[PDB]
Amino acid sequence: DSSDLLQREAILANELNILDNLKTFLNLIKEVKTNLNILELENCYYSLQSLRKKMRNNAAYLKQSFNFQQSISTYVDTLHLELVSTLYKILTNGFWKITENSIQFTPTVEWGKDKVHIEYDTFMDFVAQQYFPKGSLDNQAWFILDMTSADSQEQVRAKLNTIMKEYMNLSRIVSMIKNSIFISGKEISYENEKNILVFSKSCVSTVLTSFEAVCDFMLDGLAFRDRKTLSYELGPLFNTEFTKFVKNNASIILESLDSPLKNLVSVINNKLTRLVAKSEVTNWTHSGKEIQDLLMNKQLYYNLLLDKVLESH
Structure with a gap:
């Protein structure tokens, strides 16, 4: 006692x-x-x-x-998930809205009941720093590592991983564009007001006009960050496929001296050139000389015909 x-x-x-x-x-x-x-x-x-x-x-x-301490450490875990989930919703459903045939971007959002202003560059600045400072996802970082509930941690990883994979490396956008450009029956369109890139289903003109949509979206639709990333990733392909397509459809584009497809081809050409400059990459270049020439000099059309003929001659 x-x-x-x-x-x-x-x-x-x-x-x-x-x-x-x-x-x-x-x-x-x-x-x-x-x-x-x-x-x-x-x-x-x-x-x-x-x-x-x-x-x-x-x-x-x-x-x-056990139970008392565990419940505090789990509470705080779900604050880890709450912050990341809020980040992910503002990003994958505020700045970016990517359906399975639309890509929309907005550099500004007014979020929540109280309608708070958030700017994409400021936002993506701190997000990169805090969660992906090395340039990739830091799997040894305290944010992930201090969590002590398996399900909430998996979820925090998943969300952060896709933010890197799809909203930093833009992987899905890159593949949606890749799987449509210069492919017959795959249409693409660009509504500059709502800033959306729409993919459809549906000739030489339609292909060029839809690749011009992609171009306009990157030139005018993006933050410096993402134009640079997409241009780095797509630029080489843009180059090879623009000209290959023009050469392959020479007889419809170049056969007349002032064919109206030439205006469109010209315009895309100067845009690809503006893109390189604007994105500031170095993995591809586009002076636009080869196409300017081809459009201007009828002899070059005849050369293509001549060249093509001599392959199987």
């Missing part, structure tokens, strides 16, 4: 220490949650940074009984 009395006095002696400790944790969690509600999502990451610092450093923390 004096042991019961002792224990009771031990417990009470540690009470104010426990509540003070709890009070701190709640203040740090309040921080995370405040920032998340007011969509200060850059800050919110640093709020989680301090919190995971304090949790890593509290030696009492891991000594708390």
Whole structure:
């Protein structure tokens, strides 16, 4: 009974220490949650940074009984998922909306009930820094690594992985464009007002006009970031396939001196040239000389005919 009395006095002696400790944790969690509600999502990451610092450093923390301690560490986990999920929704469904035959981009959004202004470059600046600072996804980073619930961690990875794969490396956009340009019966269109690139199903004119849609979208539809990424990835192919197509349809494009397909071919040519300059890449070039010449000099048409004939002659 004096042991019961002792224990009771031990417990009470540690009470104010426990509540003070709890009070701190709640203040740090309040921080995370405040920032998340007011969509200060850059800050919110640093709020989680301090919190995971304090949790890593509290030696009492891991000594708390299983279920109680686990429930706090899981709460904070789902704040990890909440911040990333909010990031992913603003990105994959605010700045970008990519259906299976549309690609839409907007450099600005007014998000949530309180309608807060967010700018794509500012946003993508901190997102890159915090989650992909090496240029790829940091799988050894505390954000992923400190999480202690399997399902919420898998989900955080998945979301961050696709943000890299599809909204940084633009992989799906790159393949949608790749699978349509210069392919007969695959139409593409560009509505500059709503800034959407629409893929359809449906001649030499239609192919050129739809490749011009792609061009216009990259020239005028994108942030510097993504024009550069797509141009890096597609530029080589743009080059090979524009000219191959023009040469293959010479007799319809070049057979007359002032054929109306020449205006369109000219325009796409100067646009491809503006693209290289504008995207600032170095993996491909486009002076546009070869096409300017071909369109201007009838003899070059005759040369193609001559050349083609001599292959199987």
